[PDB]
Amino acid sequence: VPRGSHMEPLVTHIYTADPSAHVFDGKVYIYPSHDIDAGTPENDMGDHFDMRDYHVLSMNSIPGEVTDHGVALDIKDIPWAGRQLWAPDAASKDGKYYLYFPAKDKEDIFRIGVAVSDSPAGPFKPESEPIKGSYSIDPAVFKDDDGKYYMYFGGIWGGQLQRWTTGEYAGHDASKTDLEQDDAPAIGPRIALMSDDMLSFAEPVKEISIVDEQGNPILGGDHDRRFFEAAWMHKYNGTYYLSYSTGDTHYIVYATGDNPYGPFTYRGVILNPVIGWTNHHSIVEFNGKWYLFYHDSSLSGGKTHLRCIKVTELTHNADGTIETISPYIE
């Protein structure tokens, strides 16, 4: 039956999270995490998220019937992976489709890998090693209008971004949160231009600067505004929109800039807090309307690690500002 009419769960037969929505072949393809009831210890390192595979979803219309294409990738077939298949994304180039996914390697260090298919629905063959120079979590691979592709990535706390300041992993006894200097600039998300073949980075990884309306860096103590995880990039009216989750304050927020690398100026809230601790989203244009894909823990009765994806219309104003969505009002 058709789904996505009144902020209802898009699917209920499996738990889904962290939706990355794209328009490929005139359809909406969604690349979410596949939540399972692993029953592992819940803690601020995210051990309760013990996902093991990905399913690709698709819709021909919103609202519309949602197709589950089966298992697109299974952790048992990813040679380098140890555990934890977290928030993925996909990209399309020259008739090939690439699934980008964060997972811990056998040394328990998050890296980002790629898997390749001839179809947006998968299934995908994983590369035997993760992307050289990748680390941490939550990739978003953005195709700019000029044909260049960029990976945005990173997540603090359990996403380990705070352990990568030197370009090498600081170890499992390093910070469990952030820099632990609340008056220094907050940690920024990462960006790299993708190689022509989409399997590697074409440059050294850069950090993105996020600033307030005065041009001052967002500080580490500013948990309402500072980057936590779930980076996403979209463009509107020639402006670049970096949106992301603030984690412990439970917002999706956005910041605007004039190029892929920023800096980005914090503008405001995209999505207020949902049921369940995590908040993770994507923003996509389909048939001339903009949509916010997101999740909550409503279907599971509030279990942090058993989420369901939802969608609602997102409204840009002509001046580039976006109307804040509150999830349970209409």
Ligand X SMILES: O[C@@H]1[C@@H](O)[C@@H](O)CO[C@H]1O
- The residue within the footprint of ligand X, chosen from 15, 31, 54, 86 (CB under 6 A), is 86
- The whole-angstrom distance between residue 115's C-alpha and the CA centroid of its chain comes to 17
Exactly one of 18, 35, 50, 89 is catalytic; which is it? 18
Between 87 and 271, CB nearer to Ca ion: 87
122 annotated ligand binder: no
Contact 60, 27 (CB under 8 A): yes
44 annotated ligand binder: yes
Prior bond of 123 cis (ω within 30°): yes
* Contact flag: residue 282 with ligand X (CB under 6 A): no
268 binds, among ligand X, Ca ion, Na ion, none (CB under 5 to 8 A by kind): Na ion
How far is the first Cα of the chain from the last one, in angstroms, to the nearest whole number? Answer: 22
224 annotated ligand binder: no
202 binds, among ligand X, Ca ion, Na ion, none (CB under 5 to 8 A by kind): none
159 annotated ligand binder: yes
Residues 258-277 that bind ligand X (CB under 6 A): none
Exactly one of 127, 229, 258, 323 is catalytic; which is it? 229
* Contact flag: residue 209 with Na ion (CB under 5 A): no
Number of C-beta neighbours around residue 207 at 10 A: 17
Please tell me whether residue 247 adopts helix, strand or coil conformation: helix
* Contact flag: residue 46 with ligand X (CB under 6 A): yes
In 3D space, the residue among 73, 67, 133 whose CA is nearest the CA of residue 101 turns out to be: 73
| Alpha-carbon separation of residue 254 from 22, 27, 183, 288, 311 (angstroms) | 19, 26, 22, 21, 18
Contact 58, 121 (CB under 8 A): yes
Active site residue 18: yes
In 3D space, the residue among 256, 185, 264 whose CA is nearest the CA of residue 217 turns out to be: 185
Region at 302 (left for phi over 0; alpha for psi -120 to 50; beta for the rest): left
Between 185 and 276, CB nearer to Ca ion: 276
Calpha distance 228→222 (Å, rounded): 11
Contact 273, 294 (CB under 8 A): no
Stretch that binds ligand X, among 41-49, 191-199, 216-224, 250-258 (CB under 6 A): 41-49
The residue type of 156 is I
Site string for Ca ion, 30-69 (x = CB under 5 A): ----------------------------------------
- The residue within the footprint of ligand X, chosen from 155, 188, 257, 260 (CB under 6 A), is 155
Between 17 and 141, CB nearer to ligand X: 17
Site string for Ca ion, 66-105 (x = CB under 5 A): ---------------------x------------------
Active site residue 319: no
48 annotated ligand binder: no
* Contact flag: residue 18 with ligand X (CB under 6 A): yes
Calpha distance 221→224 (Å, rounded): 9
* Contact flag: residue 268 with Na ion (CB under 5 A): yes
Pull the structure tokens for residue 27: 């359809």
Positions that interact with Ca ion (CB under 5 A): 87
Which residues form the interface with Na ion (CB under 5 A)?
Answer: 268, 324
Question: Catalytic residues, which ones?
Answer: 18, 229
Return binding residues for alpha-L-arabinopyanose: 18, 44, 87, 138, 158-159, 280, 307
